[model samples]
Target: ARIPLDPFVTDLDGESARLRAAGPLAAVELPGGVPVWAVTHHAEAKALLTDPRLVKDINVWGAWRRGEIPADWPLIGLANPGRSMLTVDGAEHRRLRTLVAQALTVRRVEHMRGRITELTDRLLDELPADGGVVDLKAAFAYPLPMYVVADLMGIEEARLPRLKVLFEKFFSTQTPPEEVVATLTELASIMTDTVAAKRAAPGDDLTSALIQASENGDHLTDAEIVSTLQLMVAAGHETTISLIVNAVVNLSTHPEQRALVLSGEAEWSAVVEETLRFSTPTSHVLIRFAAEDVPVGDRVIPAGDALIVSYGALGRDERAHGPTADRFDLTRTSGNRHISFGHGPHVCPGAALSRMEAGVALPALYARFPHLDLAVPAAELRNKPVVTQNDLFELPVRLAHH
Candidate 1:
């Protein structure tokens, strides 16, 4: 029998709860003979996310940690090895997160609400009428966030379509680690060239802000700037896209929930939040290594052993979540401790912005096309995993305006 790859097994027909029931922390051997401790506990998972003991730097574990290990692969800004919050530890992670966190501030995020709503409606207005075949992934999913990211970075809107394509390369799964790094190197070259041109001319844009903000306008390196743009594009892009798509898809699957949202008869933000909890956009499990011996629940995960926390898994446990956890109830007694945006210092600084984007995009989507329905049957849908930051595969939908 072939053993299926992770999280796919978890998401296949929603068997994740079964996996959670098996144990909060399970022993699983990852590729390359590395044993990893995977956790599902709601609180412990947060502890891991927020804890200083769990190191994201590649400094510990394996003989490669002894030396540079040649970086083992390329340093594609978005591809997992760059200077995002996901790949560092302590001061570096905190600092980077703190800086980017500014862009996602409640005020900044709220500031963009009307604009995002306008963009969302404009996207729907342009949707193909008669509810014919339409790929929301492109017409909606890909473009809207692409616009937001590009505009915020002060990148040329004309180049956005190309940049979006490049962003796709940053997150590509088929390529090997080294190849991905090479792609990142290429992307960095492009961002630097554009940033320099912008500087000489000083276009009124966010790229200018990013450049200006970089260590008194002198601290940001070409590489560091590239990494920031990559993070802005990749992180801001995928999560918002997936959040809107996933929200629509999940609500479509559960009609009553959809009605509750559309009628404005209930707390829609709570509804969106619950949906986010149920269908986390990031399938990418956050990875942490036990700097020393770490006790997760009853088991002692050894030092140097890699520990991974699953937002999907922990969100499903009945103990952490209330009885309604199993069910997709918008109103639950447990309140707002979900792991969709992560928690603690590492908690996504963009969470506020992302949430605002969803709050606008999702409701407007349904409001724009009240008769909207799935373009493809559920069985025919694709769900890819191991990318960590993805929750579902291709989302296709019909914007029924008739």
Candidate 2:
């Protein structure tokens, strides 16, 4: 009933181009008038990303608020569904994004790099000692990024399993509407209590800082803190994890490519870039809305429609990256012109951290356990729909490490 967003990423063989060319800025009718516009071309899509005309404000976009989209429709449990960075256009996005950006800068995150290495090593140390294969997704890939996020946020590791369920609420496209509401409500309750506790006993975690910021001035709202953290935890957590697992899978599956990466032959920088291009975790930039009349190449994005940029399409565009771009070849010098982490002002703040976490974890994983190989055939593997969801099933692998 649906053509997936990821075929645009994995099956880069001009399918995205075809889709994009077919409708670079065309309208699609989501049932009950859900306000959908899809931008698939690379330049055109990236254009919408920087355009002031492109907005994310749900109220302004007509996706909700007044309900140009069905009022009964779901996808709601969004914490501040009204005003997160993803849903805003101008000063609002600038203001919220700047704060979070300053807080999660490269130097700020670099300090955590060593801690991340130790953390990754610690997780690997606990892997099954019997030399039996393990599900990389569960044991290593999933926990690593989320654990770091939780630790930085001051949430105890023991509470992650319970607290992490909020991510499911935040991202699930398959859940019922009521379930989304329930999860949102649950997360709100937890955030309120957690903030209150952090207030009483300040800690080194970012959550404490946010709560303190809100108290000192209007820069942070409790709702904003909750919503921002929800967005960060939901967005940052799984995509990086999936990318790590997917990068290993891509590399291991392509042994020749693996050799290139291992030997540091040619520009190894492309290895990660290509892997990122080949396996974009967040296949598309999240929902973009038309702030005013906007043009992409030859077409115009009408005002007040929900526009979703196609990362799946952009990463594989032959016009942009070339054919065979679909395949995972580290040698391809097509410039890795993908908008996976996004392109303009709204490009992901977590990009550096994601790269760091994956950079640290991926080589460590492959180098530590060279015998790593997929326990399942290529045909059996399933792609998680979004970057964050890129890896849905557990990856079973055999380990050679002692």
Candidate 3:
């Protein structure tokens, strides 16, 4: 079946529901008419995520080996990229993960609270007190994670706009086919340049730490350092922004639930968790190749096919969470079962940092503007033409009266 490859999806939730209804392992066509399998059920998705047979090595993919996929395919970089932790499995994956994981532990992320809070307060202070319309995403949500991650990676503030431009093209499914090569080249240049700068004068940040690890017999190459930095920068910020933006939208749309949190009847963390499950920040993660026939209930994902985790679909799977899984109920008493960050060893290492950022930003936002609201109808909010991310283009809203 052809997956709904709408360039800019207007109804993400609806599409996700359809994927889930198709069964656990749904055969679908990605953009460019590429055949792949999707894991839409919660249990199946979690199991497959950790399955050793399904690896991140694109070389295992039959289509890739046969040269059926083009170099300029919109998601080519993701499908067939460098040898970072994300694209490797086994010992290589463990080696790459060890250095980055050590740098981004829960304790390390928690220590970023002071810096995150300082940034949050600064952004809040800059907001117009007139209570007029504002692009909260541009003014608040977008900058928070970008700044936070950039700071952690030792990236200078001056490089943000260029990085943003390159990444916007990088993540966008709407990017013209002809521009794909140029976009990748530019992104690589920026990452390598940053690596060179970091090498010249290492800082007290993860990027420099990785560089040092390379020097200290970690067997990390320059390619590894650049690729890892690029991966961290991209993954670190985008998800956090979506989380913050989605949480605000969820609260605004559900005033009763919002009231529960504000009145201390429910914890702010509930709002974050509910948003993650209900409106997942990353819609569909890509490119896990099957090394063998992987069984999912009755269906078998044939060996050499690619698999994508439909996080958006699995998060709302009724089989796992019962009927109410479809609804965004902050007060719902459910176990912490949703694999929003993901499952297994390849799960996002930045999960803790993403949670901490939202935890910090959301409470501070509402506390500062208790009467915060959506400026336009929820129906008017638009998502970007990015297939991988459940990201919004602009979130216009009005702040509370000063």
Candidate 4:
């Protein structure tokens, strides 16, 4: 029995509940009606993520290799984004992962604290001065990470507007089928151009660092560098954007928890951790191929099948987080040891950077507008039609008390 994943995914929590009830390794169909297995439990997801038998090579996928999946599948970009760390395994994966991981170490990310704080304050100051209802997702959550990531990767300011447009299509399930190829092409072109510019004149940014590493005999090919840059820019900002947005939503909805953090009984870190678990940034990670039959719980995912790790479901797995897992509690004494940023070797390299950004942004937003509240009821907020990201279409809020 296969559970068809809702492309719109409007009712995220309810959907997650259904997946968890399905089983640990549930057969599922993606929005495009593509068959795949979803790792719906935390322990199983963690184990398989590091399992060498489960690899990232999309070519190994039976459906993909059989020419059944269309070229313009809305998810094609995610499934076959052209041979970066995301598409490889073993030593090659390590080679690509190491370069970016070194730059985002906790110490290096912490050094950007003052800059992040300044940016957070600047964005908060620019919010509606008259306390008019505003879309916080647009005004704050989205721009903060986009600017931070752009600055970190040395993306030209002129390119960001276009990049935003392209990325919107890249993650959206609602992107017209005709435009899928165009969106992927334009994104790659922008990344390619960014690499070319960095090669011509090196800078202190990550793009330049990648180029320098290649020149220094790291053996990173031009395509690898471009794909890595694209991955960083996409993953770098989107995850953090959702993190900030979800944190705001969670806090706003749970006033007691919000009060705890505001009154100093609970830390903002709790908010970040709880939000990461309760409302994970990414809903389902795409396209990992099983190189061999791998038994997960009572089910065996056959060789050549594709697997998607449903972070949204795993986060609330009662086996891992206890029976009250569904409840949003900032002071969860059970320890919010969630795999929201993922687990194992391929866990998010930008985890530290994302956490740092949320740490600075959340507290600062609350301090600046102690009376901040949702402009609309939480139930009325809408989610973007993105199967992968747990993103809202907008987050409307009042910046200050009426």
Candidate 5:
């Protein structure tokens, strides 16, 4: 039986319950009728994420191998997104990820705290004090990550507006098929240019660091460097944008809980963690193939089939977080860790950086405008038609003075 997945829009909690109700592993169809199995439980997902047998090699996927999956397929770019560290396993994954991992270490991210706060304060200052309705996602959430990523990669600010449009198409499962190919090509071109620019005049940025490493005998191909930079820019900003947007939405809607944080009874970190679980920034991760028949609960994900970890489902699984799992309780025991950053050796390298950005931005935001609020009713808000990203079209809010 096919558990139909909605690619156009998401009711995050309701759909999550449906997936969990299907058991640990559910047979599901993605947008455009692509069939795959979704791992919906927390424990089962954690186990399979680190499992060597359930490899990320797309060649093992039967449909893609047989050419049934088209290049124009809305999510084709994501599933077949070139030969990066994410697409490879074992020694190759380690080789490619090590340079990036070193660049994004917690200490390195911590060093940027002052710069982050400075950026945050600057943005907050630019907000109009007229208490007019501002698109928080565009004005705040979107800019911070873009600015941070551009700095990290030595990318020119002039290229950001175009990249932003390309990235939206890249993440949206609703993107028309023909545009998918163009989007992929354009993204490569942007990164390719950035890499070439860095090679010509290396700087004190991650792009330069990767290039210098390659020249100094790390033996990284130009292709690998470009792919790594593309992955960093796309993944770095998009998830953090959604995280900040979702956190504000959740906090504004839940006034009592918002009050707890504002009163110093609870930390903004709790709000961030709770939002990560309750309204996950990433609804579903794509395309891991099973090399052998893998049993999960009573179901077996047949070999050569694709597997998607439904982080949205796993985050709110009642069995994992107890009965009140659906509730956005900031006071919920601090042990309720969300796997939004994923798990295992291939887990997101930018996790620490994303967390730090949100941690600094959220507190500073509320402290500056204690009277910030949603201009539209919570139920009226709409999510963008992006399958992989749990993002909103906009977050309209009034920035009132204290």
Candidate 6:
């Protein structure tokens, strides 16, 4: 039986519960009515994430090869996004993955601690000082990661506003079908310009570094450089934005756990891990095709079928986190073991950077505004129409004790 994912995700938790109950491997339909299999269980997801038979080449998909998928299928950007590390496998995947991975090592990410902290403090100070209700997401959560990722990639401040607009369309299932191709084209065009600018004037940023690698016999083509830059900017900030937003919401709702962390009985890392596992940022990663029939639990994913790893369901698997899996508890010993950043060779290269950003941002935010509380009930907050991102429209909060 195929579970149709809600386009608006009006009830995410309810849907996740249904996916889990559907068993380890569940047939599901994307928002646009495209059918795919979801690895709903944690153990199966982990194994399948590493399985060589499941590859990122969209051409291997039978439907796509038969010209059945459309150019404006809403998720076409994710499904057939150009040749980057995300779409390749085997030696080619390693080749593209290595260049990006070197730049985001744990040690390298740690070096940005001071910069991240500085940005966090600046954003906190910029919050409305009168103690009136403030949309914390607009004023704080969104800008912090956008600025950090933009700076890291050497994108000009002027380009961010446009990039944000394009990304919204890129990720939103509600984006008009006619506008999908235009959105993808504009994003690639922006990246192309960024790459050209770096070539003309080298900089101390990832974009320039990528161009340098291309020139230094890394064999990265112009298209690869552009695609890689797009992936970095898109994946780099979106996940962290949700991480910070979700952490704040989780902490605000669970006051007892908040008190423990605030009183030093629990570390901020616990808050981060619990938030990642309980309210994972990316709900589902799209468009991995089965090169052959792949056994997942007792079921078999037929050859030439599409599969998506549903982190939403995997994070809450009872077998992985025990019976209390649905509960948000920082004290849980297995909180940090989630595959939110995914597992295996295709794992998120920005995992360390994302974790570091949240690690720095969360503690510092709480340290400054110890009494920060949600200005509105958590249930009133709205989810964006993006199927992949677990995003909020806004996070309204009172920054000071009233």
Best lDDT goes to which candidate? 6
TM-scores of the candidates in the order shown: 0.85, 0.83, 0.91, 0.92, 0.91, 0.91
Alpha-carbon lDDT, every model:
0.66, 0.68, 0.83, 0.84, 0.83, 0.85
Question: lDDT (0-100) at residue 220 of candidate 5?
Answer: 65
Q: Give the alpha carbon lDDT tens digit for every residue of 197-274 in model 2.
A: 797898766778766553225477777888887778667877887788778778768988888778778444566677
* Candidate 5 residue pairs that clash: none
> Which lDDT tens digits does candidate 6 get at residues 204-285?
7777777666325665677888878778766776678899999999999999999999999999999988898999989999
What candidate 6 gets wrong by more than 4 Å, as runs, is 156-190, 214-216
Candidate 5 ranges beyond 4 A from true positions: 156-190, 214-217, 334-336
- Report per-prediction Cα RMSD to one decimal: 3.8, 4.1, 2.7, 2.5, 2.7, 2.6
Stretches of candidate 2 off by over 4 Å are 1-18, 21-23, 26-35, 62-68, 72-82, 129-133, 157-161, 164-190, 211-218, 266-269, 335-337, 384-389
Q: What's the lDDT for candidate 3?
A: 0.83
Clashing pairs counted in every model: 6, 7, 0, 0, 0, 0
Evaluated against the true structure, the overall lDDT of model 1 is: 0.66
Candidate number of the best TM-score:
4
Q: Please identify model 3 stretches exceeding 4 Å from their true place.
A: 157-203, 213-219
lDDT of 4: 0.84
Q: Which candidate, 1 or 2, has the higher TM-score?
A: 1
For model 6, which pairs clash? none
By lDDT, is 3 or 6 better? 6
